[PDB]
Design a protein around this nucleic acid. Structure first.
Ligand SMILES: [Zn+2]
Ligand SMILES: [Zn+2]
Ligand SMILES: [Zn+2]
Lengths: 181, 602, 39, 82, 146, 40, 160, 49
RNA sequence: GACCAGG
DNA sequence: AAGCTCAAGTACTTAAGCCTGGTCA
DNA sequence: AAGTACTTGAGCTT
């Protein structure tokens, strides 16, 4: 589902990586770690996540190797890049060096928490999605049609997504200047 | 629905296809030959378009064939014969291009047989779903040479199927490509690739009348006519080239021409009484026309056999033939012969497939203009007393809610929280409206008891005993009853609210919060209230679609609900640091905000 | 819809095992017929 | 086709947003039809809140078959799901 | 305000009529369908679109796969047992000696043999109407059951 | 009637894919709470 | 002939709700129904049934209703009569309109006077006017010869 | 009664129908605005511009 | 079913 | 000659939901 | 009105 992180209706708070680390005591209880860590596999896919993050290729995106349903180790690339570069970019909330940490925090612990929410936030299979995209076009197609040179809005969308016609009204191109010129 | 009825079948598919000449007579239950509809005694004419055997004409008349009343008679077809048979109107154009592809003297294809057999191998290998393997078989470059090429295609397909053995989407993508290439090949050719003759060309009309001039003198050196001639020539075309046409379609009996069309039962074609006028209908009338033209064909054919005398004979006979072709075209395609035809009542897009199948009027579903209420909840929805007392739903009766259903039937169908009318397990429904409180008490006393007057009363299938009496009761404070407003653009437009029942007023009540979802201004616009009857439906509704569980509109992530105008600016006035409250106001305000008991939990 | 054989002694044994399996009118008539067939 | 064995199951162990719905629904209907209440009632009347009182205790019948799009299925009890 | 608990129906398809003068029902579909089938409420869809409006029990021949071909038996015998429906298209004429069980008769008086694969499937009345008009166009859909 | 005439000539049998088709004959849709089956 | 045959059939039983504990008793509630009644498939009237077992396939719930479904395989002993089968019965009632017999004590036989040739004559005893011995052309009394044999017509025939 | 101007020639009027409207006296302003108003024809109405 | 209305 | 891609030109279905009134032959 | 794909005839090359 384009790696999905979910169907959009819940994937929102992923980017709020500060929010979870801010409290972190209520979210862990919400996700119910004691019952989830039991049945699902954790170590193997988390190990392979680093191997996929290896900059050279021949390693798939971890999501293809290990589906995100049972292996509590797979997340898209950008999600893991985000959690890593957040841990290194904003290290203020997370403590650190390591001994002082192990009272109330742990970088690996909180990263495993975010891993866990990603697992907890997949598309629940069986969701009729096509009709979801149908609503996602219909609603804004209603929203704004009075403008505030190419035509913008529903006449435009009518060509790209409905008629897909050759010889559109104004097919233009944009070319970047180069230093030699 | 009923909860008892078990029906076991699980339909896995439907299969479309033509209908041949034997089965139309197998399903025949009578023949319609007399045009007259009704006699002086006004009774259903025997054998007429309203014959009693076709379908039970109302005023309590039992059907002849099945001999049981109208409430259960399912109607039976009838046949109306024609020795003309006119070619089926819907396939007229494809039949036309096929006729163009015909070579009358040759009775093979205008295309080279080797090319049509290439076409045959294409479909043969497509049947098992092998795409590149189909484009492979053309990899040959070379009548005798032509027969060798055909045998090369045969051996290619032979090894391909041998390796393969040891619908789905992409199948149709190729099987339509072959159809388009088939036409591109067939209609381009004029002279016979097999016979070397120039079979005469053919000219048609949009009125579905076809023929052209005979051959020219030069090509001989090298209009309108009967349908039996066309039928026989197409029979030769098919049976001589059974393979590629069988792949295209082995059966070729009545594909293009209909030897007996069926009159559907009277149940489907009623004589609606609007005021006083009694018009039979459009379809009865047009079937009458084709029947009269059929008997006219019979008489005129007899006149022909009994014998410019031959000229007048053939002219008048062809006139009768073309008239019957024209009127059967009218029946099946009212787009021709300028009342609705069948094709137009289907394809009209005002009628079926859009106005009776996808979306249909529904029972147990009321409707009102809607005022706002902030006091109830964000879950709950107001329900006026009229909707409560009138919207009914079944409730099985068990050991532990017998008390509630007892009280319900004690109250009756005229005073909330009463129930409406009691269903017995056999399948009947006995009302409580015409009864008295004494009678209702009596009937409610024997509400939990096996009353079926045997172990197996209906017949020797004894599960009817197990199911409990279903009491039809009114909605109450916990039931989940859907809401919607058209246009329903995006999914939070329909939701499920818990009912709360109010006294007096005549319009439902909702909370401000949900409003921005349904996109209403509450100026006096109105919303459909529904009530799913069974328990599976209301269960899945209450859980998946409970208002709060639709808190994120799914185009983006941002929240679509929320508090609104007064609440928000008074929020800016309460959160502001300039406001101070004493004990009295603080206690009072906190309590008004919580409202524990009705919500509960604390 | 599968069909097999039933011989004489097989009828007696099958009625025996049936009266032993599920446990009034039918059983009464079956006891009558079993008493008439035996003896 | 196949009926997937217990040793290798690919499906997701989470009691989905849907299996919860249908399970609780059909269970409430069952219990509405004079069925075995496998949990001591609290006097609760609604033929569905009993079903939730049961599923909270994970004492429910009705394993669910998850159809893979191939045509095979895996059969999960409700206690087994998360 | 218009409320429709139970009321008059349509001559053709037995869907509630288009009223407010004839207690007509409210329309639910062609976008209301998209709403629920986005909500993922297949049971609600099958309930409202089928159960509440137009519900029926109809018989089909499993052998031939036809729904027009069902005829309920007449004059089998005295009170005896119930009318056990059969299929005409898959039945052959009564010429010849056959056992009393499988035979049955016609209202006109004809006897037949065959056509016993008649089961009891739920089917919305509108599909019955579609079968009628379709076979009037001479083309009939053959639905299988397994 | 055009799609009808072509799919009728060829007689192409679906299983039946979309929920509109699953619905016209009244059966529960493929999607949603209908995707799986529940057994005792 | 040997008219009795055993048929192990497969039928599709509905497991009612209150019997969701065990299907076996739920099998009973409807297996006691068909007995001594006609099942049209097997072309015979049910006599008895044993060997009740359900093929373990995790019985299915009808997908809008609370009672489930399951295949059960059970062996019936239906009396399958054919044209030309020969049947015996003990005579109970006799009259100069037909002959009355019971086969297996359960199944009735009422054979009109037409199927009896005019060769057999009725004697009327002075004690009971209706009941009386239906002698043959030979002079044999049939009342002590309670076991009487004839053929199936569909109803019997003693005319050869 | 209806408004179908049925004449052998249209007399240079585009639409043949709708020339007449009931004077619903529902409220006086509606009575006036029936008497004053004009309308330019359904032929242009059906066009979406 | 068609033409004017109306939310 | 005639084969075969090229050109304008001829037939041809859709245009949001609902809901409620009225008049009409 | 918009625009679609559909089909036929006239001019150029082997
Ligand atoms: Zn009938
Ligand atoms: Zn030829
Ligand atoms: Zn049949």
């Amino acid at each position: 589902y384009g790696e999905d992180s979910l169907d959009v209706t819940k994937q929102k708070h992923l980017t709020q990586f500060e929010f979870s680390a801010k409290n972190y005591k209520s979210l862990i209880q919400k996700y119910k770690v004691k019952s989830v860590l039991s049945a699902v596999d954790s170590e193997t896919a988390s190990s392979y996540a680093k191997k996929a993050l290896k900059k050279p290729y021949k390693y798939d995106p971890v999501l293809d190797k290990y589906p995100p349903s049972r292996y509590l180790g797979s997340v898209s690339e950008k999600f893991q890049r985000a959690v890593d570069e957040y841990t290194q970019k904003n290290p203020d909330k997370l403590i650190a060096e390591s001994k002082l940490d192990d009272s109330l925090l742990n970088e690996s612990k909180f990263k495993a928490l975010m891993q866990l929410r990603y697992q907890q936030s997949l598309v629940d299979p069986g969701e009729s999605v096509g009709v979801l995209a149908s609503q996602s076009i219909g609603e804004p197609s209603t929203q704004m049609t009075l403008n505030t040179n190419v035509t913008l809005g529903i006449p435009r969308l009518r060509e790209i997504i409905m008629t897909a016609s050759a010889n559109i009204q104004t097919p233009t191109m944009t070319l970047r200047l180069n230093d030699g010129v | 629905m009923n909860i008892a009825q078990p029906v076991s079948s699980e339909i896995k598919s439907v299969k479309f296809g033509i209908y041949d000449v034997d089965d139309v007579e197998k399903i025949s239950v009578k023949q319609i030959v007399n045009p007259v509809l009704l006699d002086n005694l006004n009774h259903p004419t025997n054998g007429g378009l309203y014959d009693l055997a076709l379908g039970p004409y109302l005023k309590n008349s039992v059907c002849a064939t099945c001999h049981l009343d109208e409430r259960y008679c399912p109607g039976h077809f009838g046949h109306i014969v024609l020795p003309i048979p006119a070619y089926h109107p819907l396939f007229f154009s494809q039949m036309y291009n096929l006729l163009r592809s015909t070579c009358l003297y040759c009775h093979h294809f205008k295309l080279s047989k080797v090319k049509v057999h290439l076409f045959f191998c294409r479909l043969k290998l497509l049947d098992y779903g092998l795409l590149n393997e189909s484009e492979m078989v053309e990899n040959v470059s070379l009548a005798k040479d032509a027969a060798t090429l055909m045998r090369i295609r045969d051996e290619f397909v032979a090894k391909s199927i041998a390796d393969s053995r040891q619908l789905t989407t992409l199948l149709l993508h190729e099987r339509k490509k072959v159809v388009r290439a088939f036409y591109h090949a067939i209609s381009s050719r004029k002279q016979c690739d097999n016979c070397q003759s120039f079979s005469p060309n053919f000219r048609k009309e949009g009125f579905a009348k076809i023929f052209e001039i005979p051959l020219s003198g030069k090509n001989l050196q090298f209009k309108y006519m009967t349908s039996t001639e066309v039928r026989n020539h197409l029979r030769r075309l098919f049976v001589k080239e059974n393979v590629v046409l069988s792949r295209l379609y082995p059966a070729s009996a009545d594909m293009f021409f209909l030897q007996n069309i069926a009159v559907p039962p009277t149940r489907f074609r009623p004589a609606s009484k609007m005021g006083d006028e009694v018009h039979e209908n459009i379809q009865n009338e047009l079937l009458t026309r084709i029947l009269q033209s059929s008997i006219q064909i019979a008489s005129l054919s007899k006149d022909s056999t009994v014998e410019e005398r031959r000229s007048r004979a053939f002219e008048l006979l062809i006139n009768a033939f073309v008239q019957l072709q024209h009127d059967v075209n009218s029946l099946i395609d009212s787009n021709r012969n300028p009342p609705p035809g069948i094709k137009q009542i289907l394809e009209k897009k005002e009628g079926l497939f859009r106005k009776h199948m996808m979306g249909k009027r529904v029972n147990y579903a009321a409707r009102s203009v809607i005022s706002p209420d902030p006091n109830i909840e964000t879950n709950e929805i107001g329900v006026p007393p009229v909707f409560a007392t009138k919207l009914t739903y079944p409730e099985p009766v068990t050991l532990y809610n017998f008390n509630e259903m007892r009280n319900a039937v004690i109250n009756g169908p005229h005073k909330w929280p009463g129930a409406s009318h009691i269903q017995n397990e056999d399948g009947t429904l006995i009302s409580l409206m015409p009864l008295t409180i004494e009678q209702r008490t009596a009937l409610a006393n024997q509400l939990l008891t096996p009353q079926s007057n045997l172990i197996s009363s209906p017949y020797s299938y004894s599960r009817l005993i197990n199911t409990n009496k279903k009491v039809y009761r009114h909605v109450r404070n916990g039931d989940m009853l859907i809401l919607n407003r058209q246009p329903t653009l995006h999914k939070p437009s329909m939701m499920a609210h818990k009912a709360r029942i109010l006294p007096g007023e005549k319009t439902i009540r909702m909370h401000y919060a949900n409003c921005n979802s349904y996109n209403a201004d509450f100026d006096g616009d109105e919303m459909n209230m529904h009530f799913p009857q069974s328990t599976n439906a209301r269960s899945e509704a209450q859980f998946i679609a409970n208002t709060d569980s639709q808190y994120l509109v799914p185009t983006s992530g941002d929240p679509l609900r929320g508090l609104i105008q007064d609440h928000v600016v008074m929020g800016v006035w309460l959160t502001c640091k300039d406001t101070f409250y004493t004990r009295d106001e603080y206690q009072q305000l906190l309590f008004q905000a919580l409202k524990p008991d009705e919500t509960g939990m604390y | 819809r599968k069909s097999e054989k039933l011989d004489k002694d097989a009828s007696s044994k099958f009625l025996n095992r049936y009266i032993q399996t599920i446990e009034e009118s039918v059983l009464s008539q079956l006891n009558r017929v079993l008493m008439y067939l035996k003896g | 086709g196949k009926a997937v064995a217990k040793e290798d199951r690919t499906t997701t162990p989470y009691m989905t947003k849907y299996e919860r719905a249908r399970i609780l629904g059909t269970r409430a209907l069952q219990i509405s039809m004079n069925a075995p209440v496998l949990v001591d009632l609290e006097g609760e009347t609604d033929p569905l809140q009993i079903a939730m009182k049961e599923l909270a205790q994970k004492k429910i019948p009705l394993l669910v078959r998850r159809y893979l799009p191939d045509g095979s299925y895996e059969d999960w009890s409700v206690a087994e799901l998360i | 305000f218009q409320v429709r608990t139970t009321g008059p129906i349509h001559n053709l398809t037995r869907q509630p009529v288009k009223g407010r003068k004839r207690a007509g029902g409210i329309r639910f579909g062609e976008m209301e369908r998209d709403a629920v089938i986005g909500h993922g409420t297949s049971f609600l869809m099958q309930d409202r679109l089928m159960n509440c409006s137009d519900y029926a029990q109809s018989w089909v021949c499993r052998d031939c796969g036809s729904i027009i071909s069902i005829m309920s038996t007449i004059s089998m015998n005295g009170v005896g047992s119930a009318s056990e429906v059969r299929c005409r298209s898959c039945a052959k004429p009564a010429l010849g000696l056959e056992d009393t069980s499988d035979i049955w008769q016609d209202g006109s008086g004809k006897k037949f043999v065959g056509g016993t694969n008649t089961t009891l499937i739920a089917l919305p009345s509108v599909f019955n109407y579609l079968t009628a008009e379709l076979t009037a166009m001479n083309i009939k859909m053959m639905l299988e059951v397994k | 009637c055009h799609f009808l005439t072509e799919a009728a000539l060829r007689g192409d049998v679906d299983d039946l894919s979309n929920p509109s088709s699953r619905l016209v004959v009244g059966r529960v849709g493929n999607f949603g709470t209908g995707s799986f089956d529940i057994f005792t | 002939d040997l008219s009795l045959y055993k048929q192990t059939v497969d039928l599709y039983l509905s497991i009612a709700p209150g019997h969701s504990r065990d299907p076996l008793n739920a099998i009973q509630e409807h297996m006691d129904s068909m007995i001594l009644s006609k099942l049209p498939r097997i072309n015979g009237i049910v006599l008895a049934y044993d060997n009740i077992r359900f093929l373990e396939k995790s019985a299915k719930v009808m997908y809008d209703s609370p009672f489930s479904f399951i295949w059960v395989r059970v062996d019936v002993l239906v009396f399958s009569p054919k044209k030309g089968d020969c049947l015996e019965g003990k005579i109970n009632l006799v009259s100069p309109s037909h002959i009355g017999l019971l086969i297996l004590g359960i199944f009735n036989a009422s054979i009109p006077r037409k199927s009896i040739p005019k060769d057999w004559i009725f004697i009327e005893p002075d004690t009971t006017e209706e009941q009386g011995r239906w002698k043959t052309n030979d002079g044999n009394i049939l009342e002590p010869g309670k076991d009487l044999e004839f053929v199936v017509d569909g109803q019997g025939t003693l005319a050869n | 009664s209806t408004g179908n101007l049925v004449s052998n020639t249209g007399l240079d009027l585009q639409q043949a129908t709708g020339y007449t409207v009931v004077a619903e006296k529902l409220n006086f302003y509606r009575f006036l605005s029936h008497f004053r108003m004009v309308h330019r024809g359904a032929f242009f109405a059906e066009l979406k511009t």
